[PDB]
Structure 1
Amino acid sequence: ELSTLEAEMAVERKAVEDQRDGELEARAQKLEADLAELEAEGAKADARRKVRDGGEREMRQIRDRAQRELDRLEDIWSTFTKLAPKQLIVDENLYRE
């Protein structure tokens, strides 16, 4: 059953990655909109730098949350494939998964 299990896992990883890319494109377009809103209205390089740092921090947050979920799936899959008796699973959460 390794083939179909690996297929389902690959589709699930792809789902995580495509969701991340949708979120990041949305937030980057929102940062562009916010920066243009500052540009046309009253704004100096202070407010521009603040909004840019905030948008980039949120984009790091999205990327790193999706990356932690991808690494979660990675350890799930490698653990299942290399599973053997006498192996200890310390994380109760990973065992439930």
Structure 2
Amino acid sequence: LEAEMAVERKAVEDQRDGELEARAQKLEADLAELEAEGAKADARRKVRDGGEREMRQIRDRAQRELDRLEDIWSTFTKLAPKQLIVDENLYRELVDRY
């Protein structure tokens, strides 16, 4: 069970890393295009702030997914009778997955 959950964690973290890499590559391409335009300093700062906020939001969503999976893992390992799951979404995830 530890081995199968470890490979599952590897797969989920690998798809998270792939999403991060793809988003970072797209953002870098957009930044390169903007730099090629050579816009004003104000425009450069505006677009840089927009891209940085987009990357922060992407990382926030990735961390949300990661901590959701970590909560799933902790609950599965720290599982015993008389345990309540208020959030039906978490219980649905557990039953659908394991």
TM-score range, shorter chain: 0.7 to 0.9
Unaligned stretches of 5+ residues in structure 1: none
Match of 2:61 in 1: 65
Return the offset for 1:42.
4.6
Corresponding position of 1:21: 17
Aligned alpha-carbon RMSD (Å):
1.9
2-structure distance, mates of 1:90, 1:35: 44
Contact preservation (8 Å) 1:31, 1:51: no
Q: Is the 8 A contact 1:28 1:55 kept in 2?
A: no
Under a length normalisation based on structure 1, what TM-score does the superposition of the two structures give? Answer: 0.75
In structure 2, runs of 5+ residues without a counterpart are 94-98
Could you say if the C-alpha distance between residues 45 and 87 of structure 1 is closer, same or farther in structure 2, counting changes exceeding 3 Å? Answer: same
Residues 47 and 80 of structure 1: CA distance in aligned 2, closer, same or farther (over 3 Å): same
Structure having greater relative contact order (Cα 8 Å, sep ≥ 6)? 1
Compute the TM-score of the two structures, normalised by the length of structure 2: 0.75
**Stretches (4+) displaced over 4 A:** none
SS at match of 2:10: helix
> Which shifted more, 71-80 or 20-29?
20-29
Q: CA deviation at 1:62?
A: 1.9
- Cα distance between partner residues in 1 of 2:4 and 2:28: 36
